[PDB]
Amino acid sequence: SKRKAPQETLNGGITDMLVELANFEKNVSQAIHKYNAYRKAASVIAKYPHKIKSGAEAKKLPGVGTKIAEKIDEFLATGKLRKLEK
């Protein structure tokens, strides 16, 4: 019904990483399956009316599966890592 929310900084940083790599999927030859992966997760997280704090909050979204949702958990968890811990 014509919503158009206001500009705000909620989850516009994640979609920037899903929309960027998303181009790397279609721009590549055999990468159309992972293409829709970030294409949908980038649209739902970029136009979501709320925020998330766990990979599960990204899986409940319509369009995100377990692969893309798994990357979301790494975002809310820490952000980057070189080696593992024990």
Curated annotation (Swiss-Prot):
Q: Where is this cross-link: Glycyl lysine isopeptide (Lys-Gly) (interchain with G-Cter in ubiquitin)?
A: 40, 60, 80
The protein's superkingdom reads Eukaryota
**Positions carrying N6-acetyllysine:** 71
Provide the binding site for K(+) 1. 59, 61, 64
Q: Where in the cell is it found?
A: Nucleus; Cytoplasm
What happens to this protein after translation, modification-wise?
Methylation by PRMT6 stimulates the polymerase activity by enhancing DNA binding and processivity.
- Residues the record lists as binding Na(+) 1: 59, 61, 64
Q: What is known of its domains?
A: Residues 239-252 form a flexible loop which appears to affect the polymerase fidelity.
Q: What does this protein do?
A: Repair polymerase that plays a key role in base-excision repair. During this process, the damaged base is excised by specific DNA glycosylases, the DNA backbone is nicked at the abasic site by an apurinic/apyrimidic (AP) endonuclease, and POLB removes 5'-deoxyribose-phosphate from the preincised AP site acting as a 5'-deoxyribose-phosphate lyase (5'-dRP lyase); through its DNA polymerase activity, it adds one nucleotide to the 3' end of the arising single-nucleotide gap.
Tell me what this protein is called: DNA polymerase beta
Give the organism the record lists. Rattus norvegicus (Rat)
* Gene that produces this protein: Polb
